[PDB]
Write a protein that binds this ligand. Sequence first.
Ligand SMILES: COC(=O)Nc1ccc2c(c1)NC(=O)C[C@@H](C)/C=C/C[C@H](NC(=O)/C=C/c1cc(Cl)ccc1-n1cnnn1)c1nc-2c[nH]1
Lengths: 5, 238
Amino acid sequence: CTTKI
Amino acid sequence: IVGGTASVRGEWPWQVTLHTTSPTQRHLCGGSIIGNQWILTAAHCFYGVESPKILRVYSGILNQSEIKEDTSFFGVQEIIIHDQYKMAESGYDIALLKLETTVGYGDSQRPICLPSKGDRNVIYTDCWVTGWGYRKLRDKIQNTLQKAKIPLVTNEECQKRYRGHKITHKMICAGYREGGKDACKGDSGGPLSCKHNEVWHLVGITSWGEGCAQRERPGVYTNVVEYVDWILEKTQAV
Ligand SMILES: COC(=O)Nc1ccc2c(c1)NC(=O)C[C@@H](C)/C=C/C[C@H](NC(=O)/C=C/c1cc(Cl)ccc1-n1cnnn1)c1nc-2c[nH]1
């Protein structure tokens, strides 16, 4: 993903 | 889910079933794995929940019958509800569950990508609502996870369908003008997953609707893209 958790 | 069909095992590996043990154990809400100790769900799911000690998160489940006293679950360390949340119909219907232990990723349980700020402009055409909820207003929780493909509806069109409500851009609606396919009781908190450029994104969180799958009454979802910074604030805290 572009958004990283 | 109304008008849906049985999912295949491993189809929605970010889908979880959140159970409550008080007074007796039962499915409470859906949820989505977004990180190895993080479940994204709806804030309204915790109405009357005084402690995270009564919560059990089950991942890698196709059928509710896989859940018995000996079935492994994740305990909940913390319930994080958006500060501005009052009720589902007013928005901010979003919550995070911080798990007591980490999820080990595999083909049965893995995270769904959050939408990107750049993807706020993209038009999603392959969206699915999943859950163990009712198939109609007066029904029962379904054993097998159900799925239904539903089109996204513009804010303008959703606002004309809900006269008397304020449909904000922090909400995203989905449904057929003729009705027939939608989320229903027991589905809330679960995902509205949209496939874009071969990647699944968590576009919405099942929130509310006037009845289930009614003509000209789209399902109303928390518009996840509008909460990416809020999720990152809570999950990436120093
Ligand atoms: C044996 O186990 C069971 O029977 N468990 C079991 C059975 C049922 C339920 C629960 C547990 N959970 C709760 O009641 C927990 C409390 C806090 C949530 C309240 C609201 C929640 N709404 C939804 O799930 C979805 C609404 C909804 C969403 C969209 Cl997008 C469209 C139309 C919708 N509907 C309009 N009218 N109905 N649906 C709900 N969940 C249940 C009942 N209502």
